[model samples]
Each structure stands twice: as structure tokens, then as C-alpha cells.
Target: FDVIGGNAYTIGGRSRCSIGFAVNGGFITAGHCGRTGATTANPTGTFAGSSFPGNDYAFVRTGAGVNLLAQVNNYSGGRVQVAGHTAAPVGSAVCRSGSTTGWHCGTITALNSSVTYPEGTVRGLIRTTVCAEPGDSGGSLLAGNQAQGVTSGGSGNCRTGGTTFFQPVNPILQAYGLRMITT
Candidate 1:
């Protein structure tokens, strides 16, 4: 099986989200999408770690055959190689990719911000102008070749433009002791 970041992923064969990044032993996504031990489709993986309402991140360890590609889908049938995992600074141009909205680019509007969602409060989120919607959670947010964050939640639609938040990627990797399969 091949896993591509930004592709649609189903949680327990129902709830949907997107993939964040591919690590050596697994991949990462939104914890709000699944809990520990939950099953995953599109690649047959299991949630190894999950924390939502606070971190909104999850790490899924693959079960069967999987080729971890260090790339994010461009939604044009092309791919963007993930070169590094540096956090993009505020005001830096960034892009996010997901099954719901494809690829959209915007600049980081703020950093270390917190927002309260219906589920709970999440802290240290990266705010961006990139428009996203439901089913876009857990997708990749990258600035050029630098890995940024994963989709947290957002309001409005891409039609008139809106804001979005993402959980930083580096910390998630650190938490799980997982190294990204970067180029």
C-alpha cells in the first residue's frame, strides 16, 4: 500500500479526514478524528497516539505493506516533495492540501494562538488565511519545502476566503519519537 499526504482517510470506516505526514513506522493525523486503537482505512493503519481538544494530533502506525512517500499530493496528479520539517515563521507563505479543498496557499497570520472549539480548547495553534472545510482535518501544511502544521479546524468556505488553524507538526513528531520521511 502507498500512503500520500493530503489524501482522504477514513476513521473506523466512517469519519473522514486527511493525512498529515508519513513517518518511519507510521503517519500522523488529527486526534479529533480518532482515538487510540481506532482503525483506519485507505491504508489499513491503527491509531497509536491521539489527543484532541488540546493538541488535535494523532499518529497512526501502519499494519500491512506500506510505502511511505515523503511527498504531499498537489491535487494535480503531481506531488510536492517534503524536504524538511522546519517550522515556518509567522508571515511566511504556506500551503495546505486536503481531500476536501485540494491545495490552497496563504501566509501564516499568527503563531502560538489558542482557540476554543465545541469539542474543547486547543492551544499553540498556527493561524493562516488558507481556506479549509470539513473532511480537511489532518492534512499537510507546508511552507515551500518546510513542514508547517496539520489542519485543526476552520470556519467559512474557500468561496469568499476564511481562516484556519493547524497543530504544529514538529512537536507531534517529537511526542511520538517518529521521524518524518523527508527527502
Candidate 2:
């Protein structure tokens, strides 16, 4: 399986969510997907660690023989190379790919914002005009070739053009002491 960002993955065969950008041996995703020890298939991996509530991101270490690459599926039979980890500025055009929604484009609405989900309050998130739905969490948000964040949560749906929030990737890397696999 081409486990680029936006590919479908399961958490212990339970809930389904999208994969985020690739790291050295694993991929990053929304923390709410699962706890430590969760399994990921179609590319196979296990959640080595997770952090939610205050933050919403997790890291999954792939099983042996899985080739990890830094890329995001364009939903067009190709992929977008993740050339770097730089954050796009507000008002910049961005795109997201998810299992449920495939790919959608929008603009950055805000940065360093906070939102209170039932899980808890997550701070330092990036807000966007992108639309997403269930099974879309953990998907990748990108601006050009730079990775922005992982899908957090939001209201509305793709039909009505909803707002979405992302748990920025830089902090996840910093928190976990992991480096991104860039092109």
C-alpha cells in the first residue's frame, strides 16, 4: 500500500482514520485515533506513543519491511512531495487529503488558535476553511509542498464548506523528538 498522507488506516481494527506525513519509520496522525499499542494496517504499524486533550497527535512506528516516504496523495493517481516542514502563512491556499473526503482546497483562516472539543482543549492549532468529515481525522494539511498539520476536528461537512482545525506538525515533531521524512 502507498501509505502517504491521506491513506486509510485503522486503529487496532477499530476506528478508521487518515494517515499523516511520514516520519523516519512511522507516520504522525491525530492523537484521538488511538492510544499507545494501537495497530495500523494496509502498511502495518503500531502506535508507539500518543498525546491528546492538550494536544492531538500520535506517532506510529511501522512494522519491518514497510517503506516510509514523505508524501501526500493528490487523490489524482499521484502524490505531492513534502519538501519541507515550513508552515504556510494565514490566507495562503492549502489542501487536505483524507479517506472520506479525498482532497479539498481552502485557505488558512487562523493560526495558534484554540478549540475545546469534548475530549479537551487543544491549543496552538491552525484553522482553515477546508471541509472534512468523519474518518478524516489524522489526515494531512499541506500548502504547496510544506506540511501544515494533522486533521483535528471541526463542525459542518464537505457539502456546506465547513471549518476545520489541524494540530500543527512542527509541535508534534518537537514534542516527540522525531524528524520528518522530507523529499
Candidate 3:
């Protein structure tokens, strides 16, 4: 988990899907950061697209031979594998690892939800009770043992625990012709 600007984001060290799996072109993440193409230094600092609005995902093309383990950090050095999944069911157990509180477990509250953002309204979101904050956006959202989506946004923090939404990775991959990484 990596903390940036007082918010937690799941770096490779904290959860699977924190960083999108590396493909032939580059890695993928929430597009919200793609707006400026700013590189974040985690020893793999090179911004391809921090995030793009509406889609809220990004593409990071690293130098050749970069390491992309296709796993999410589980804190305590434990890791969750990232692979294979169309989606998860509501009321199912889920968890998220972020730069903030390390790792937190929650449940899938809803699916195909509609969330209104400053940029625009994003639909088909996976809603969960996995309390998240500012930087937590773009982190990983996993269910039981499968990778789900990336943290999108919410209105509360980890303290009170509120609803947090994620942009489903399925459409992102289909729209961009990308593939989701699995372990």
C-alpha cells in the first residue's frame, strides 16, 4: 500500500489489482489518474496515463522486461493472486488492500450501480462496503479469491465505513482491447 497526499492507494505491496497486470503493451489502472499522465515513483515510475475520465483507468507502458507479478498485496507480505473472473455476486465476501489501512475486508453490496462523479456519471459499477478515501481510488477490489475491479470513489473514510464504488475491469478491457491478469 502506498500513501499519497494523505490518501491510501494499493500499490503492488498491498493488494492484487492494485496495479493492473502488465500486458504486451503496458500495465492498466484506474483512468482517473490518466488525466495528466503523471508518473508515480514506486521504482516503476513512468506515467503512461495516470487515469482517464469516464473510464477512470490508465495504461502504464514500462521499459522492456519490467516485472508484473499479477498479484495484489495482502499486507504482512502475503499476496492474493490476480486472475480469471467475470464478476462476483452481491452479499459475497470481498476485500481490498490499499496504501491507507493496509488491508480491509468487506462484502459486495451491489453490482451495476450508478455513481455520479464530478467528471460525469459512471454506471455499471461494483458497489461495496469497503470504506475508502481519496487516494484509495484506483486501488484493487477483490472478492473471496478473484480479482474484481479498481476502486473508483466514495463519500466516506475507513473510520465510519461507507459505500465505495469501483469501475468494473471487464468493460475497460473490452473497450481498450486489454486483458485482465490472473495468477
Candidate 4:
């Protein structure tokens, strides 16, 4: 429900697999989703990879039956191309795309922030005023046309503008030395 990306396709209801942005070995999702040795499910409702929080991300090995596509939905079906790079800046306009609300935009408010969630608190997050909801935790936050970060947490929902947070994607890819799965 939190993350959706990669080979898995997303629709109206929650997809079993928390598909995330393609990372080195697999996909990058929230650590809270689970951790190393943790079990995961795919879109077809099948077992996938171990969720590891230590890395603050998870990987879905390349050969997995799950599909690996690089485009994130822009809600218009006209797609916002996923270029392989992360160079978002504060004050820059950014947006989030998720299965829940479709899309939402706002300005980058802060960087390296520490956000506290009911489960736990995560530091080093890129804070933004962009609104997000429960189902959007691990979705993409795009600045202009580039992938900026993954949905982390926030205070409000799409119905009303609220503060949101995301972990930048560059570090996720660099830490794993993974090339983003691109269109």
C-alpha cells in the first residue's frame, strides 16, 4: 500500500506487492515496510524479497517474476519520463504520484529532516510541503521531471494541503549502486 513501482503494475485497490523505485538489486521501499529476512508479496499475490530496514530500503532481485518498468504515472496517462538521476533542490517545486490521490504538488521545504512516525522516527529525510496520504508512503516525489525522493511521512492528506517527507532517491541508488529501471 505504501510503495508501488518497478515491474509491478498498480491500479485502484492496494496491490499486494509494495512496488518501489528500481534499485541496484531490487526495489527501494520504506524500512518500516519490513526488513532483511522479512517476507514480501508481489502484484499477483506471490512471495517476493526480504524487507530490510537496516538499509532503509528493499531489493527485488533482477530475475524475479515481477516486471521492471521505469515509468511513474503522472495521472494523465501521458507519463512523466523517469530519467536516471536525482538532483532536487530546496524551494524547488515537486510532486508525488501514488495509487491513492493520483498526484499532488508543493515546494521543497527542508532537507535532512527527522520525521517521527507512529511506528518509529526516521532521520535524514527531505521535507516538503507537498501533501500525501497513508497509502502514499513509498511513492515517487518528482521535482520538475526528475525523480527526487520516496514518500516518507507527512502531517496532512490530499483533501487539504499538508506537510510531507521523502527520502531522496539518489542516495538509495548510490548506496545500492543500482541503475534506475528506465523507460
lDDT (C-alpha, whole model) for all candidates: 0.89, 0.89, 0.62, 0.62
Q: Which has the better lDDT: candidate 2, or candidate 4? A: 2
Worst 10 residues of 3 by lDDT: 1-10
Give TM per candidate: 0.97, 0.96, 0.78, 0.78
lDDT of candidate 1 over 1-183, digit per residue (tens): 778889988876774899988888888988888899988888789999998988889999996687888999999999999998988788999999998989998999999889899998999899999999888889999999778889999788788899999999988988988899975
**Candidate that scores best on TM-score:** 1
lDDT of 2 by residue, 54-130 (tens): 88999999867777778898899998999988988999999999989899989999998899998789888999999
For model 4, name the residue pairs that clash. Answer: 5-19, 7-67, 7-68, 24-178, 26-60, 27-60, 35-51, 35-52, 36-51, 36-52
Over 4 Å off in model 2, which ranges?
none
Candidate 1 shows a clash count of: 0
90 Cα displacement, candidate 3 (Å): 1.7
Q: Give one digit per residue, the lDDT tens place, for model 3 in 1-183.
A: 221111232334433234544443555567765444455444244555444454566665555445555666777777776666558888978777666555777888888888778888777788888887665666667775566777777777888888888777677677667765543
Each prediction's total of clashing residue pairs, residues at least 3 apart in sequence or on different chains, is 0, 0, 17, 10
Candidate 4, 1-183: lDDT as tens digits: 222352233223434223457554456665555445544455322213322232234444544465555666677665666776667778999878865667788999888888666656677788898887666766777776677887766797888778987777777776656688665
Q: Let me know the TM-score candidate 1 reaches against the reference structure.
A: 0.97
lDDT of 1 at 159: 83
**CA lDDT for candidate 1:** 0.89
Steric clash pairs (candidate 2): none
